[PDB]
């Protein structure tokens, strides 16, 4: 078990900064998903403005399509 001990000093010390970066990436994406929450709502506003006056009354005939 003499072999493992050597590696702590050499290899793994260098990789400890690499493992800091994984904590930073984790932190980052909470902020990014949070952002898309806000955005969702703000997009909602836009849609609402269309719904509003002025409007013109029609007669729906038939569908061609679930969304058209």
């Amino acid at each position: 078990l003499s072999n493992v001990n050597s590696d702590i000093y050499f290899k793994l010390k260098k990789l400890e900064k690499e493992y800091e970066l994984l904590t930073l990436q984790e932190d980052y994406i909470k902020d990014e998903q949070r952002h898309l929450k806000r955005e969702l709502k703000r997009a909602q506003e836009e849609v609402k403005r269309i719904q509003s006056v002025p409007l013109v009354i029609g007669q729906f005939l038939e569908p061609i399509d679930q969304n058209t």
Partner: protein, 39 residues
């Protein structure tokens, strides 16, 4: 061999600590990744 069995708890503490950190990091970043993509 016999010497190194005894002296091990100095070394063993630091490396096993570090490894645990990798296991929990990977877990977290990929869970949040899925959430971000859906939204």
């Amino acid at each position: 061999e016999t010497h190194e069995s005894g002296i091990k708890p100095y070394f063993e503490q630091k490396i096993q600590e570090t490894e645990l950190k990798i296991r929990s990091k990977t877990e977290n970043v990929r869970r949040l990744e899925a959430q971000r993509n859906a939204l």
